[PDB]
């Protein structure tokens, strides 16, 4: 929808997307916020968006930032779960990291990406804690 909405997505703005982000899986996270049935697939639609990493495509940077914040929230929401794969998450994270590098190449502020970078530090810190 966000690519399709275009100027209408700009008319919807970051807030209609933010309201959806607030509505689902926001802050509380846990098993209840994310459907067991959605499982990887709810993450996978986000992962496909992460794979596109289209911050530039979105008409509004703030809407893109809200989507990036939602992705950062999704990473905070993400906890290892049945039907969720850390390697799949790492591949999504790698797609997110490439998107983050593109945002880094042209970002006025780290903004949501700095929150994503903190999420990037998380798990990588766990890998440092182990490996």
């Amino acid at each position: 929808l966000v690519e399709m909405d275009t100027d209408q997505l700009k008319l919807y703005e970051e807030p209609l997307s933010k309201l959806i982000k607030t509505l689902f899986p926001f802050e509380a996270e846990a098993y209840r916020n994310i459907e067991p049935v959605y499982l990887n697939m709810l993450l996978e639609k986000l992962c496909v968006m992460f794979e596109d990493g289209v911050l530039m495509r979105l008409k509004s940077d703030l809407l893109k930032a809200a989507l990036c914040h939602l992705l950062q929230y999704f990473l905070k929401f993400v906890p290892a779960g049945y039907e969720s794969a850390l390697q799949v998450r790492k591949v999504y994270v790698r797609n997110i990291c490439k998107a983050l590098l593109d945002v880094l190449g042209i970002e006025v502020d780290a903004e949501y990406l700095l929150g994503p970078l903190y999420a990037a530090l998380k798990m990588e810190s766990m890998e440092i804690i182990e490996e």
């Binding site: 990887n40 697939m41 794969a85 799949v88």
Partner: protein, 349 residues
């Protein structure tokens, strides 16, 4: 492609779901599907991958093949299951109960064969095999060692999987795959089953496309791998093969010969000596057809095979200036073959 490709991926998942799609197994996946905990996690990932495969879909591509990341993920999980089957083969390699472990490995191999059918169904699973350890997949290389080591049927399934992989594989990738067969040809035996040998012949046709196997030649006789395989084909004991199935193995050899004939590149060669013996074996089959003198579909297939055999015999006469020297070894057969050729001309309509 698109949703229809995803449905084809789902159909491959449905075949894995079906108990068992593989022959000789009561159940496929599920209890048969299931560190051991890591393998269980991989099996859950494979189920997620199967759900992902349902959700999402030149010459090496061949017919366009749907590619699913989940199918590739399932293939990695399948590789872990294959690794458990490989570990039983590795334990057998270490050895100088275990059969039950081999039976569990065989069920895993049957699952791997179902996975290989799924790999034929899904490009991404094939692509992961194509990338390999760095080439041959590390699990696949272990499987190739296992194939060298029921078990013969699993090896035949692996050879069939290799032939499917070879069609998926780029000819340069197939050449890197090629020469695995030369070790396999040494593994292949008259004692080893003819149906397995027919799968090897299908693998040999895939090998003929591969450049390294194409570099391997009938010339150099017994030392040449192709000639030695032809010599086994020339014996044609076919003890495992029965009736049409024995004819089908001969027909597969004829198709492989036709592929060699199509190729521009294709005694001194055991295979050339074998080809006169093979022509005599074809003549014996032709004599049976002459004795039959095509209402049965198998009989109709045999008549087409006899027409193919006659074309191969015509090609063999074109191939050798000394057609007569080859003929003199097969001359008692050749007089029968000439009667058979007249019967074949009568058969042609």
């Amino acid at each position: 492609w698109r949703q229809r490709s995803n449905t084809q991926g789902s159909i491959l998942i449905n075949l894995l779901l079906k108990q068992p799609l593989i022959p000789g197994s009561s159940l496929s996946l599920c209890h048969l599907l299931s560190s051991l905990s890591a393998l269980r996690e991989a099996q859950n990932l494979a189920f997620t991958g199967l759900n992902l495969v349902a959700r999402n879909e030149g010459g090496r591509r061949a017919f366009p093949l749907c590619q699913l990341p989940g199918a590739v993920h399932f293939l990695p999980l399948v590789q872990f299951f294959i690794g458990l089957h490989c570990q039983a083969l590795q334990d057998l390699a270490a050895a100088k109960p275990e059969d039950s472990v081999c039976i569990l490995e065989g069920f895993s191999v049957t699952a791997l064969s179902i996975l290989q059918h799924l790999v034929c169904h899904s490009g991404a699973v094939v692509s992961l095999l194509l990338s390999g350890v760095g080439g041959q997949h590390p699990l696949l290389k272990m499987l190739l060692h296992l194939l060298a080591f029921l078990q013969a049927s699993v090896l035949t399934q692996c050879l069939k999987v290799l032939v499917k992989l070879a069609e998926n594989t780029s000819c340069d990738f197939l050449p890197r795959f090629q020469c695995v067969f030369q070790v396999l040809p040494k593994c292949l035996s008259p004692e080893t089953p003819l149906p397995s040998v027919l799968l090897a012949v299908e693998l040999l046709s895939l090998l003929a496309d591969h450049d390294q196997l194409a570099p391997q030649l009938c010339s150099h006789s017994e030392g040449c791998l192709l000639l030695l395989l032809y010599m086994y084909i020339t014996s044609r004991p076919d003890r495992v093969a029965l009736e049409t199935q024995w004819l089908q193995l001969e027909q597969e050899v004829v198709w492989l010969l036709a592929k060699l004939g199509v190729q521009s590149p294709l005694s001194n060669c055991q295979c050339n000596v074998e080809v006169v013996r093979a022509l005599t074996v074809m003549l014996h089959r032709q004599w049976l057809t002459v004795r039959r003198a095509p209402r049965t579909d198998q009989q109709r297939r045999t008549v087409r095979c006899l027409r193919d055999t006659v074309l191969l015999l015509h090609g063999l006469s074109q191939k050798d200036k000394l057609f007569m020297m080859h003929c003199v070894e097969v001359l008692h057969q050749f007089d029968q073959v000439m009667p058979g050729v007249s019967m074949l001309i009568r058969g042609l309509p």
